[PDB]
Amino acid sequence: SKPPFSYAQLIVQAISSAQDRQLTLSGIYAHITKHYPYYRTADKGWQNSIRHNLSLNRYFIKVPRSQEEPGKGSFWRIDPASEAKLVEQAFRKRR
Amino acid sequence: SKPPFSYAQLIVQAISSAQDRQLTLSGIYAHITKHYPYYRTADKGWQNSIRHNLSLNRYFIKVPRSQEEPGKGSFWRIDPASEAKLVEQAFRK
Amino acid sequence: NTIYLWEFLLALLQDKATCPKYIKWTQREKGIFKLVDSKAVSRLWGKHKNKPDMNYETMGRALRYYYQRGILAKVEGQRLVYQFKEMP
DNA sequence: TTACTTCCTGTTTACGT
DNA sequence: ACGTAAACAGGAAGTAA
Numbered sequence: 256s257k258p259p260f261s262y263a264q265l266i267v268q269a270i271s272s273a274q275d276r277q278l279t280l281s282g283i284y285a286h287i288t289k290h291y292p293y294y295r296t297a298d299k300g301w302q303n304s305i306r307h308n309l310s311l312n313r314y315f316i317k318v319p320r321s322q323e324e325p326g327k328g329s330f331w332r333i334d335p336a337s338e339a340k341l342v343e344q345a346f347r348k349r350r
Numbered sequence: 351s352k353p354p355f356s357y358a359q360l361i362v363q364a365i366s367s368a369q370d371r372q373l374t375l376s377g378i379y380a381h382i383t384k385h386y387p388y389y390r391t392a393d394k395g396w397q398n399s400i401r402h403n404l405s406l407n408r409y410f411i412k413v414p415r416s417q418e419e420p421g422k423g424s425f426w427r428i429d430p431a432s433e434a435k436l437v438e439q440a441f442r443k
Numbered sequence: 444n445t446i447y448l449w450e451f452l453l454a455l456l457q458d459k460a461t462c463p464k465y466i467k468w469t470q471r472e473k474g475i476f477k478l479v480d481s482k483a484v485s486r487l488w489g490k491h492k493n494k495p496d497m498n499y500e501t502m503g504r505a506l507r508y509y510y511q512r513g514i515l516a517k518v519e520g521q522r523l524v525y526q527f528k529e530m531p
Numbered sequence: 532t533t534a535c536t537t538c539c540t541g542t543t544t545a546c547g548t
Numbered sequence: 549a550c551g552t553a554a555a556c557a558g559g560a561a562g563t564a565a
Contacts, residue, residue: 261549280540304552310542317541328540349549375546405548412547420480422522422554423546445565448535481555492564494536499555505535507557512534522544522555 258291259349262301262308266315267345270333277318277330280306314341353386354443357396357403360386361410362440365428372413374423375401409436444491448505449514449527451488452476461487469518474527481523
């Protein structure tokens with residue numbers, strides 16, 4: 256039932272799916288939930304994991320929020336430096 | 351001045367030093383650092399190595415923490431089965 | 444009922460059945476103390492407003508609040524340790 | 532007004548496989 | 549190739565006094 260992908264990979268996937276290559280934490284969450292039902296917003300552990308990942312990985316870069324929808328959080332995008340590779344591998348299942 | 355001992359050996363030593371023959375990861379770390387200044391908590395690689403060792407070696411057994419002291423990490427002891435031998439050899443450069 | 448969080452903490456510290464177990468003094472002289480069993484303490488605190496499952500996250504917010512007032516402060520580097528600034 | 536509380540987003544630490 | 553749990557910060561909006 257647990258998707259064989261790394262939280263980072265999931266995040267990358269989510270970002271790629273976004274129309275502008277950006278997403279709010281909430282947006283990311285949503286993306287994950289819609290894709291994979293195993294990750295029910297009900298339990299928060301995975302959410303925490305995601306947040307941790309975001310905080311850590313230097314290739315996740317943080318964008319300041321706008322007056323288009325000023326609500327919960329800032330926008331997340333992938334560092335162009337190593338984006339392409341990440342995107343490619345984003346759907347590479349685990350052995 | 352890298353100590354000529356195996357991470358496992360170091361762990362064993364640490365455990366033996368403990369008053370109750372147990373130690374938390376943190377405790378182990380501390381023991382190592384005090385004994386051998388070469389292992390500065392500054393760099394984390396050796397710590398990782400230690401953790402790896404703990405995870406692997408079947409003769410290192412994990413004790414779950416309690417509501418007498420709910421804190422950071424669990425307790426580590428040596429499997430009585432082959433403890434004595436380990437202790438003996440623990441300082442065999 | 445009609446109790447502050449700091450006051451509750453102090454009470455806990457004072458009473459023998461919670462004196463070391465859930466909270467202890469690091470440096471009683473400087474009013475420094477350490478939440479041993481953070482969770483339990485939080486729960487207890489919550490109990491006073493019924494709020495049964497009070498998590499040390501919510502309770503931590505409260506403590507943080509105390510920073511601006513100048514009642515508590517953070518012991519920056521020690522896990523689960525704060526310092527009362529107002530004391531006898 | 533003060534005093535927490537719920538909730539959210541984020542950073543950071545620590546342990547264990 | 550992380551997974552997971554928890555500490556610690558602070559804005560913002562709710563709730564109670």
